[PDB]
Enzyme design. Structure first.
Site, PDB file in Angstrom:
ATOM      1  N   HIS A 130      36.342  34.547  41.249  1.00 22.91           N
ATOM      2  CA  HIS A 130      37.166  33.654  42.032  1.00 22.91           C
ATOM      3  C   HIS A 130      36.325  32.778  42.936  1.00 22.91           C
ATOM      4  O   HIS A 130      36.789  32.297  43.955  1.00 22.91           O
ATOM      5  CB  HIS A 130      38.118  34.499  42.851  1.00 22.91           C
ATOM      6  N   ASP A 173      38.200  41.587  42.991  1.00 17.66           N
ATOM      7  CA  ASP A 173      39.168  41.660  41.891  1.00 17.66           C
ATOM      8  C   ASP A 173      38.836  40.778  40.702  1.00 17.66           C
ATOM      9  O   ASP A 173      38.226  39.693  40.851  1.00 17.66           O
ATOM     10  CB  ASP A 173      40.533  41.202  42.366  1.00 17.66           C
ATOM     11  N   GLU A 174      39.262  41.259  39.530  1.00 23.73           N
ATOM     12  CA  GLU A 174      39.377  40.459  38.317  1.00 23.73           C
ATOM     13  C   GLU A 174      38.097  39.792  37.802  1.00 23.73           C
ATOM     14  O   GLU A 174      38.132  38.653  37.340  1.00 23.73           O
ATOM     15  CB  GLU A 174      40.432  39.382  38.512  1.00 23.73           C
ATOM     16  N   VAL A 175      36.982  40.503  37.852  1.00 26.33           N
ATOM     17  CA  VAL A 175      35.720  39.928  37.440  1.00 26.33           C
ATOM     18  C   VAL A 175      35.529  39.955  35.924  1.00 26.33           C
ATOM     19  O   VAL A 175      35.553  41.009  35.285  1.00 26.33           O
ATOM     20  CB  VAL A 175      34.545  40.608  38.166  1.00 26.33           C
ATOM     21  N   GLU A 177      39.938  47.377  42.095  1.00 22.94           N
ATOM     22  CA  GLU A 177      38.964  47.326  41.005  1.00 22.94           C
ATOM     23  C   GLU A 177      37.637  47.880  41.420  1.00 22.94           C
ATOM     24  O   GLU A 177      36.972  48.517  40.617  1.00 22.94           O
ATOM     25  CB  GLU A 177      38.752  45.909  40.498  1.00 22.94           C
TER      26      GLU A 177
END
Ligand SMILES: *[C@@H]1O[C@H](CO)[C@@H](O[C@@H]2O[C@H](CO)[C@@H](O[C@@H]3O[C@H](CO)[C@@H](O)[C@H](O)[C@@H]3O)[C@H](O)[C@H]2NC(C)=O)[C@H](O)[C@H]1NC(C)=O
Ligand SMILES: *[C@@H]1O[C@H](CO)[C@@H](O[C@@H]2O[C@H](CO)[C@@H](O[C@@H]3O[C@H](CO)[C@@H](O)[C@H](O)[C@@H]3O)[C@H](O)[C@H]2NC(C)=O)[C@H](O)[C@H]1NC(C)=O
Ligand SMILES: CCc1nc(N)nc(N)c1-c1ccc(Cl)cc1
Ligand SMILES: CCc1nc(N)nc(N)c1-c1ccc(Cl)cc1
Ligand SMILES: CC(=O)N[C@@H]1[C@@H](O)[C@H](O)[C@@H](CO)O[C@@H]1O
Ligand SMILES: CC(=O)N[C@@H]1[C@@H](O)[C@H](O)[C@@H](CO)O[C@@H]1O
Ligand SMILES: *[C@@H]1O[C@H](CO)[C@@H](O)[C@H](O)[C@H]1NC(C)=O
Ligand SMILES: *[C@@H]1O[C@H](CO)[C@@H](O)[C@H](O)[C@H]1NC(C)=O
Lengths: 479, 479
Positions: free
Chosen positions: B226, B281-283, B334
């Protein structure tokens, strides 16, 4: 320049022209059939001048046939126009005032500023006219009362989008904000409070305001269902239930059709538009059936215990009242589906999402004009870019011959009022309704998603700039 | 009088008292540890006077322990208060300024006008304190830039709702609006434009403004994912992909942790709050893996081709940077789920909707404090009364011993910015976030749907009255 909806034919050149705010007029070409005395055009010229802000000095507007300045738009109003953008004098040419109003919007969308502030337009020619003639937005002023101001802004936003029918769902179960002159009690007892009312003068305003923009105001006075509020100022109009207190209008009394005649006669004078929307949707039988005087009527007509037969009886009688005052009727599908006898040219509005293409086929096979709204329930909000879903609808993918398709006259985006009011109505409507507007105006085959995305994001910023609080499509910013 | 959230203990009597606008003071009881010199309380007294508009002459405010006027709220700030509503002098008694601010809100919600205009309050006693101490709203000022004004109104609406943490998701892929002083390029090159920026003075304002209301401003500087916008003003910070151009921060260079140390040191001084939210998050690994210098690092650490191991490496190193400046960390699940080594008291935020009670159990079994947001994604809009769904959550229905439950410190309602900006943010947030606020403040067992419905509709009108454009719950009107 972002165009929305995208005109039927656009031919641009790379020659740039400039405009000088304190030095650019829109006026009547000497051959136009309209001149200064013509308010509708005069007010347009002024308001667009505002919107808009190698030389273009002027935009001449030529109305070719009788301008219809002083009339209300109707179903078959001529909306076509052409735009020749050239130096030194550009030209907007339309058969009628209605065309001219559309064209003015297109012209405004073509002027723009370069990186240095300079007002610029490309040399170009535009040929435009709508793919469908009935292009509605439905608003609900009963579930919540919308103040007149917010109705007007909606009218402005509709213009910017070339929509031309405001489907005014004015009353419903929850509140009766319409003030009636032959029936003062309806609103006195049914409105939310004395200050949640539309006076004859509020109605007058809305109507003029929409007219000045080529918008038709189609009133919906929904019966026999959705009529709980009518009962507070009308003794004996609603069926009493034998166990809710009241159900739908009691379709068995004379006093009922008595009232309905007086009432619709007032409506017929108050609202200039040709059609009256009669509703007819979602009628509960559980009540009529618990009731013994209805029971008795059922027996006397030998209607068995098929209550559609009675829904039919009623609705048909109302249909006749409408016909008697020389107006048209619109009607939610249920009326057709329950096999009432309809006059020729009654419009049926298909609203139920369940396999509506087959609905469209049935109605059109019966020979009635049909209006779609089913995939366009905008109160039915959800996450993410749902405008795409709305935009991708092809209204004419149903089975049906040519003549059958010719009966499809258009559609409406609906915003019902259960969850909506002044605080959330605009960002909810816009730009989501824009997707609907373009599909109802542009060609059948205008459908590149990327291009739609691109013009729409830019159109939306325009709307925001003109003080419509329309919501984003996705991440980004304006300017 | 509608109360929201509903205080822990309310005892009312049928004795009515009246208030005279031009004649009613709120001030410090002579024994209070706060007096006039105390801005936070002074400004409250004035702003509530405004909100509010057989005798009650006055509301005395008594702060019992050291007032903490000049401090920032933190995690364990004392929010408890009591309210003795009596003639002629009512009393608000709190340990600390934070209690007093809550109480003032409750008092305002108790004053009201009868049918004749008369300001009235019931004799009563109130004992109140929060069920959870971390009560957040997350805002996204990257997907869209929120102007400072709109952030402030949000802060006002949060006060009215007893929320106390503004989770400021300030930057993200799309835009870097935070102006950094040791790194001018980050915002110069990453912001949407020069006028979509938060200057050190915008940040200062927001912080003070929230503080004055007992709100903590928790910054989120999300890494390593992000972070697409960080790259425009930071050479070599992002991994280049071998085929998108850039992926997550490149966790293998010294230059990377060099920057991150300088940066977080600035953050640590700019934001007074104890915690920094590190995201995590969300890597995406697809990128790191296509890259050969990463490939090589993987080989040298013997990390195989488990890229969680590398996500771990990075995040842990950042964790240490945070620890080195004596601040706390918050972290999206995460980070925990991918088994990085966390310091004691690192807060894990559970955001993934998939069986989160078992997430809550795992995190708490590891002994870390935990914050829930998963069922409270408010950007995830849908049709109808969804506030009910949010309100009915019982945060503590997971398996886990007492000591385990004591680790659950609260939650946040989230409004992510993909579809949100100034045009739609408020009606989207409110009252939907109210449902979340009450559940995080009132008792475990406060849950009558009808009563919630009733106070909420009335609370919402109050908000509208105070100029928060909060949206309806269902059909109806105000006044
Ligand atoms: C409306 O008028 C503008 C201004 O003429 C048109 O934009 C211009 O379009 C041309 C292409 O026709 C651009 O030229 C290009 O040059 C570069 C090399 O630097 C190359 O990438 C291309 O092969 C091309 O030759 C020109 O930059 C461009 N923009 C401006 C601001 O001048 C525009 O196309 C017209 N719009 C329409 C819809 O016709
Ligand atoms: C705050 O004070 C108000 C005003 O005293 C309280 O409301 C009042 O409540 C009583 C019931 O305790 C009402 O009396 C009722 O009379 C009728 C007969 O006409 C009957 O239906 C009941 O059995 C009852 O005796 C009274 O009308 C009512 N309202 C007003 C405006 O005076 C209110 O309860 C207090 N609120 C709380 C939460 O304690
Ligand atoms: C014609 C149907 C209809 N009629 C009335 N009078 N009110 C409504 N609210 C609706 C309606 C139906 C489906 C949805 Cl999803 C939303 C609204
Ligand atoms: C922590 C997850 C997250 N992180 C960032 N940086 N942005 C987001 N938009 C989200 C998100 C996840 C699920 C939903 Cl439904 C909406 C938003
Ligand atoms: C119901 C009504 O008044 N219809 C008129 C009609 O006579 C006219 O020809 C049409 C097209 O211009 O506009 C309208
Ligand atoms: C990080 C930080 O500054 N924490 C302080 C702490 O010393 C204090 O005891 C607490 C409760 O009042 O508030 C805060
Ligand atoms: C009801 O209806 C009939 C015919 O439609 C009418 O002429 C009659 O007088 C009415 N009767 C009553 C009892 O109101
Ligand atoms: C990278 O990291 C090490 C130890 O962490 C450091 O001391 C070294 O000098 C750095 N090397 C380069 C080539 O930048």
């Amino acid at each position: 320049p972002a165009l929305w909806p995208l005109p039927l034919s656009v031919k641009m050149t790379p020659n740039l022209l400039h405009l000088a705010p304190e030095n650019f007029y829109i006026s009547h070409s000497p051959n136009s059939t309209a001149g200064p005395s013509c308010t509708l055009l005069e007010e347009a010229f002024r308001r667009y001048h505002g919107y808009i802000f190698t030389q273009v000095q002027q935009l001449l507007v030529s109305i070719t046939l009788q301008s219809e300045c002083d009339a209300f738009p109707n179903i078959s109003s001529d909306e076509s126009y052409t735009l020749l953008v050239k130096e030194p004098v550009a030209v907007l040419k339309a058969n009628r005032v209605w065309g001219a109003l559309r064209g003015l919007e297109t012209f405004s969308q073509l002027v723009y500023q370069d990186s240095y502030g300079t007002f610029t337009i490309n040399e170009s020619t535009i040929i435009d006219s709508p793919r469908f003639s009935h292009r509605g937005i439905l608003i609900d002023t009963s579930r919540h009362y919308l103040p007149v101001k917010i109705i007007l802004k909606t009218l402005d936003a509709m213009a910017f989008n070339k929509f031309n029918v405001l489907h005014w769902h004015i009353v419903d179960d929850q509140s009766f904000p319409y003030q009636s002159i032959t029936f003062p009690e309806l609103s006195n007892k049914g409105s939310y409070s004395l200050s949640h009312v539309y006076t004859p003068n509020d109605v007058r305003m809305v109507i003029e305001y929409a007219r000045l923009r080529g918008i038709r105001v189609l009133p919906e006075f929904d019966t026999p269902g959705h009529t709980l509020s009518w009962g507070k100022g009308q003794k004996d109009l609603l069926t009493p239930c034998y166990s809710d207190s009241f159900g739908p209008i009691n379709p068995t009394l004379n006093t009922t059709y008595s009232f309905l005649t007086t009432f619709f006669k007032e409506i017929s004078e108050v609202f200039p538009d040709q059609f009256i929307h009669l509703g007819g949707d979602e009628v509960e039988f559980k009540c009529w059936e618990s009731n013994p005087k209805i029971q008795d009527f059922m027996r006397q007509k030998g209607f068995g215990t098929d209550f559609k037969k009675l829904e039919s009886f009623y609705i048909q009688k109302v249909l006749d009242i409408i016909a008697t005052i020389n107006k048209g009727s619109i009607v939610w599908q249920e009326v057709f589906d329950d096999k009432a006898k309809l006059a020729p040219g009654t419009i049926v509005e298909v609203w139920k999402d369940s396999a509506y293409p087959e609905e469209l086929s049935r109605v059109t096979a019966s020979g009635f004009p049909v209006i779609l709204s089913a995939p366009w329930y905008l109160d039915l909000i959800s996450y993410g870019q749902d405008w795409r879903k709305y935009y991708k609808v092809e209204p004419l993918d149903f089975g049906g011959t040519q003549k059958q398709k010719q009966l499809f006259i258009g559609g409406e985006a609906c915003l019902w009022g259960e969850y909506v009011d002044a605080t959330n109505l605009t960002p909810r409507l816009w730009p989501r309704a824009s997707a609907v507007g373009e599909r109802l105006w542009s060609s059948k085959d205008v459908r590149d998603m990327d291009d739609a995305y691109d013009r729409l994001t830019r159109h939306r910023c325009r709307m925001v700039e003109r003080g419509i609080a329309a919501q984003p499509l996705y991440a980004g910013y304006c300017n």
